[PDB]
Design a binder for this molecule. Sequence first.
Ligand SMILES: *[C@@H]1O[C@H](CO)[C@@H](O[C@@H]2O[C@H](CO)[C@@H](O)[C@H](O)[C@H]2NC(C)=O)[C@H](O)[C@H]1NC(C)=O
Ligand code: NAG
Ligand code: NAG
Length: 1034
Amino acid sequence: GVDERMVLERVTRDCVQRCIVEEDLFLDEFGIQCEKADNGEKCYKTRCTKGCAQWYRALKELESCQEACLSLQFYPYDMPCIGACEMAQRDYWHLQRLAISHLVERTQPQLERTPLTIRWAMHFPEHYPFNIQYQFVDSAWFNLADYDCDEYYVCEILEALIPYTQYRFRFELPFGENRDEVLYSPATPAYQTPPEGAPISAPVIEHLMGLDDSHLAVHWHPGRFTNGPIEGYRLRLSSSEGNATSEQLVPAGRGSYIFSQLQAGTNYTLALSMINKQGEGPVAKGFVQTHSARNEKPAKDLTESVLLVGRRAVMWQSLEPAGENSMIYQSQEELADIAWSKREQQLWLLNVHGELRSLKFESGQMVSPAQQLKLDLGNISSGRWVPRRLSFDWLHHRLYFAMESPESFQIISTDLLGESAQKVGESFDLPVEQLEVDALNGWIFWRNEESLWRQDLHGRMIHRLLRIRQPGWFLVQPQHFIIHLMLPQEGKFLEISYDGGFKHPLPLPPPHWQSFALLGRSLLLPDSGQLILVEQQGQAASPSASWPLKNLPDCWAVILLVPESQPLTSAGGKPHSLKALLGAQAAKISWKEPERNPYQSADAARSWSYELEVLDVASQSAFSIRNIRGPIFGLQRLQPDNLYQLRVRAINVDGEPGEWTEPLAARTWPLGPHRLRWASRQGSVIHTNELGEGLEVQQEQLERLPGPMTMVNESVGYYVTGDGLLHCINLVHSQWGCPISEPLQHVGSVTYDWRGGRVYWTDLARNCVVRMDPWSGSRELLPVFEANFLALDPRQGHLYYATSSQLSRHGSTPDEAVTYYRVNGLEGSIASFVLDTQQDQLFWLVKGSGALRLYRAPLTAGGDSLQMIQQIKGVFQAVPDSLQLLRPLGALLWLERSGRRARLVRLAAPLDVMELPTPDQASPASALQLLDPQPLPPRDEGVIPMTVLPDSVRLDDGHWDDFHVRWQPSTSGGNHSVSYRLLLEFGQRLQTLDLSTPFARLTQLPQAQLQLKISITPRTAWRSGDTTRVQLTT
Ligand SMILES: *[C@@H]1O[C@H](CO)[C@@H](O[C@@H]2O[C@H](CO)[C@@H](O)[C@H](O)[C@H]2NC(C)=O)[C@H](O)[C@H]1NC(C)=O
Ligand SMILES: *[C@@H]1O[C@H](CO)[C@@H](O)[C@H](O)[C@H]1NC(C)=O
Ligand SMILES: *[C@@H]1O[C@H](CO)[C@@H](O)[C@H](O)[C@H]1NC(C)=O
């Protein structure tokens, strides 16, 4: 069209103007040095204008730019023609990327449905390698492989997909090899795949735990791939030493089940699998033991006591065979509720008139008289909240109430002086008949006329546990997470967990009972004349023990005076996710808290302290540190380059230790100041240490999103800004030191060779590698194609390069071309690579589809092995050209794509991937680099080839068909191999040779009387020499 021809004329005009302006910028390999108006084939201008005449013939004919620019005079590669072809081709693809991007990103694909069919109604211009991608809804985008498509982009999906999943699709459109050229299509509606077959994912067990000696709880949420709607579950509990297995089919709505009637101290195996309409899925297994059998002490051996509470009396009775009965307090009015303390020994009373009286006691005797403690409600009350029920928080020392306003019923918390009222929960209409606080698990349970409830201590999670008509006395086990509730009208006795899902009736012995207590498996039951200890299956006519009562006709509450009624200790402690970051003399160790049960709220007791064990591995000596208040610790005064073994455990408020963590093995750095250099995305540079502390904000200010900076010498550095710009800063004195005035577009990475004294970068526009002298600014085009990242070995001069597909080595001759890795582009691309010189190794990162893989290879020409070191399966990936080698640690270091963390993999221990946090004044980071402690060595004079003398160029005597031109053999200081690039200028035609000999075996000369111009360019693998231009007549 007419829009296409303007793009072709603009790209061709910009290409010809680019060959005009850059005609003196590059030194050619043969030392050409044309004038500004010569118009001969040797020059930069004619070959570069040959590059801009064959860029559109190379796209339509679909030939490479190296295949299109194939000259017999310049063999094997013509650098200005190939370079002008690739900048003109990526200028064309950049203009076609901006020409279509609104119509690409505004029109949206539609799914129609037999195989799955995507319809994408785009009308592309006639002026003109698409990829279809998929993403799992509730990740990263993965490349789809099997698709058959029409030319109108109605695309049929032939890849077999996972059933009963949601899939969102898009069209990735790559304009040309450049990654930026890719334009993404908009998002699709999520598609339910039709379900078939068995499930392929196991259920995920969140909390599997033992409640007591005869109960065992499991909580789970379903796994990711279900392949149908859930019809139910299959739970199979099997003993390790036993022949009785219990199978239970639990339906789809339940995510918790509690096994009952088990055995004590038996370490159980639970099989958990999904059930759908088509089959049964895989089995997830977990290992737990039940608790030990609690001691059924006989009726002769009982040293505990009970509190027997009437309407008008509080009575103390010891549980001895000789029963001691004493009257603690007698009131002239009726009581409503009490509270009690085990360690403070305080016993608050609340009457029917709503006056709160406090009292203290020991051994059934009153040691402090009953003072009246009034409630200072303050701004919380709206007036006349007279109290009805009462309970006590034994951890936060709070009194929890339930009042009455004549209008509504409200639970508050107040202090032991009544000074701090906090309204908890919302108002409700039914009266509380019993109020209990679970202080250890952070719950409060109350019971009304029709039901039983559950709040936490701040009122956040309100749950109704049970609906039953007229419930009686309920008692709370905090250690076993079971509420035992008596039903007096129905005559049974019922056993409820804290979520309310597990209920179980128990045999109540027949008399009505209006209170109970639970001593072991036995049941303390009051009457009007006696208190009996019955073991839950026996009759009331034959108890295990009996205690007579005289002055208590009515007894609505029995409170057992044990410390297990009000515990301090959660009795389960296991710290997890132990991590450690290490320096030379110090370590930064972070773990997490022990995890919360489903029967524990956010107001639970989380008062654990920690003990960390540090084991020296080489000497087997352990020092143990204690009383760590928090989930982090910083170790100090360690030994450098030593392996340490680290375990941690939790110590509860009682001081009872928990179970040790599975050990982490980690090694300190070697001794020395090891300075890590950071660069923020704003452009600021700080210098930290091994641990990320000791920050020094440097004076230099870089450009936005910089890469790693390559030293040439101690003033001048070169870095690649992340839009593609290559910069140059003198850190010391800024008005001199840098040969380039402007930044350079379309540069991938940059390296420096210290021996040749040459800066190497990848020109992504020219698809080649540019070698540049930093003292002068003369550039040299090198025939290394499609390279993104470079490295050079200084011992022999091999250039190691990374394509997005391959990783290879460029030598002086093409016999030395060794390719180390190849990957398909749908599988992934190489993210960065590191050449190791001292141990003769290579490392590279491969950015996969949802994965990050790390590899290793030697530097031999015949490769011995190739080891995949470590794989990270996640959406978080690396910054490209950010892999660094830590040669003191023996480790690899890369920066993650978010820029707020970095990953370290040690070569001795690859499984432990250390996380190092980015410091706060450079907190979005784009570069991380370990500084070399030694300075850079200067330029070797033993790699510079000497100039061939102009009087030494002579012709040997021979015929006209076979001439021989010879010269003095150029050498260097170190005796390296010196090769020669040669130019023959006779008549109009030209002839170029590459030689490894100081003579030239010359043929195909036409005749005699020929004036013959000779150019000698000596070179080594690091650096080319000056050009010797003589004039010789045959
Ligand atoms: C670091 O290297 C730079 C070149 O990259 C050196 O600067 C050159 O030094 C001479 C001597 O004064 C100047 O006349 C040149 O103009 C500089 N070259 C360029 C290209 O600008 C510099 O000497 C080095 N610095 C140190 C401290 O060694
Ligand atoms: C429970 O039994 C399994 C073997 O079936 C064993 O691996 C596990 O350690 C046992 N748990 C204990 C002893 O706590
Ligand atoms: C190079 O060879 C010469 C001639 O034998 C010798 O004197 C010199 O030491 C050699 N230099 C090196 C660096 O090997």
